[PDB]
Design a protein around this ligand. Structure first.
Ligand SMILES: Fc1ccc(-c2nnc(-c3ccccc3)[nH]2)cc1
Ligand SMILES: Fc1ccc(-c2nnc(-c3ccccc3)[nH]2)cc1
Lengths: 194, 194
C-alpha cells in the first residue's frame, strides 16, 4: 500500500544524491520504486511534489527533535544548551544532504517549498527568541538587541552557513568546524554586554 | 558608442525593478535602449550576460568602497570601525536591490555569476580575517575561533541577512534594523571572551 509511496520517496532521495531533480525523470522514480509511470501519478502529481514531501519530512524531523530538547532540558551550562539545539539542525540536515540541497534550490521555483521553509523558520526564530527572553528574564543574558531581531539574524546565519558547509561551497566553513563556529557566534552575541 | 552599452545596462536595471530576468526579453532591452534586436547582439550575447555585467559593476563598487575605507581609516572606536565596513555592503547592495535580487537568483543557473560571487566573497572573508588578526595582534581581540572560520560565518550571515531584509522575505530583520543587528553580532563575536 503505502510502501509504494515510501518506495518512491526512497528512490527520489537516492537519485538526488548523484544528480539534480531536473535530471531525474518520473520514469526514473517509477522504475526505482518498481512501478509503472501512471501508477506513480496515482501517488504524486509531479516529481516536484515528491521533493516537497521529502523536504517536509526532513523539516518536521528537525522540528520534532527540537521539541524533544525543549521538553527534555539537558543538565549543563548555557553554551552546551545552545550547542545541543544547533546540533539538531546540523545532524538532521547533515544526514539528509541531497534533500537539503534540492529543497534549497526548489525555494526559487516552488511557492509550496518557499512557504514550507518560511513557516518553519518563523517557528525556529520564535523559539530562539523565547529562549533568549527566558535567559534575559533570569538575569543571565543582557537586554541588548530586540530578541526577535537577534534570533532572526542567528537563524539566517545558520541556514546559510550550514548549507554552504554541507555543499562544500567556496567559501564555506569546513563541516567539522561549523558547529563550534556557530555556537561561538550564538553564545557571544546572546550573552555579550560588548 | 559605449552609451549604447550603458543604455542597455540602464534599461536592464530599470526593468528588473518590476519583473524577473525571465519575464524580460532581448526585445524589451533593445526597445528600451532605442536599438534593434540584432544591434543588441553586438553588445551582449544574451540578456543573462547583461545581468552578469550589472552584477559585476555592483560587486566591484562595493569592493572599491571597502578598499577606500581600508586605505582611509576613520578615527573612532572598534564598533564604529566594523559598522562603517558593513555599511559599504548595506548601502551598495541596498542601492541596487533589483540587481542584487536577480544576481542572487542567477547563481543557481549561471556558473559565471556563481564564480563572480565566490571570488569576491573569498576576498571579503580574507579581508575580514586580516582585520580580526590585526585586532588580536594588538591585544584588542581574544584568540578564540580560527579568524578565517569566524570571518566566513559572519560574511555568510551578512549575505543571507542583508538580502532577506532588502527583499522583505518572511522571515527577515526590518531593513531599518539590520545594520545594528549585524554590527552587534560582529562586535560581540569578534571581541567576546565568552
Ligand atoms: F533554541 C534554538 C537553538 C538553535 C536553533 C537553530 N540552530 N540552527 C538553526 C537553523 C535554522 C534554520 C536552518 C538551519 C539551522 N536553528 C534554533 C533554536
Ligand atoms: F572589514 C569588513 C567589514 C565588513 C564586511 C562585510 N560586511 N558585510 C559583508 C557582506 C559580504 C557579502 C555579502 C553581503 C555583505 N561583508 C567585510 C569586511
Amino acid at each position: 500500500g503505502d510502501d509504494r509511496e515510501l518506495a518512491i520517496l526512497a528512490t527520489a532521495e537516492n537519485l538526488l544524491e548523484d544528480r539534480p531533480l531536473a535530471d531525474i525523470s518520473v520514469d526514473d522514480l517509477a522504475k526505482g520504486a518498481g512501478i509503472s509511470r501512471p501508477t506513480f501519478y496515482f501517488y504524486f502529481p509531479s516529481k516536484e511534489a515528491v521533493l516537497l514531501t521529502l523536504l517536509d519530512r526532513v523539516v518536521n524531523q528537525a522540528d520534532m527533535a527540537l521539541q524533544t530538547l525543549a521538553e527534555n532540558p539537558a543538565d549543563t551550562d548555557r553554551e552546551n544548551m545552545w550547542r545541543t539545539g544547533i546540533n539538531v539542525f546540523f545532524e538532521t540536515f547533515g544526514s539528509h544532504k541531497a534533500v537539503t540541497r534540492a529543497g534549497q534550490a526548489a525555494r526559487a521555483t516552488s511557492v509550496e517549498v518557499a512557504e514550507l521553509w518560511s513557516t518553519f523558520m518563523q517557528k525556529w526564530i520564535a523559539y530562539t527568541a523565547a529562549v533568549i527572553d527566558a535567559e534575559r528574564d533570569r538575569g543571565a543574558a543582557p537586554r541588548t538587541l530586540p530578541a526577535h531581531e537577534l534570533a532572526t539574524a542567528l537563524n539566517l546565519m545558520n541556514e546559510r552557513t550550514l548549507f554552504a558547509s554541507f555543499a562544500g561551497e567556496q567559501p564555506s566553513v569546513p563541516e567539522a568546524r561549523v558547529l563550534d563556529t556557530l555556537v561561538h557566534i550564538w553564545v557571544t552575541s546572546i550573552y555579550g554586554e560588548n
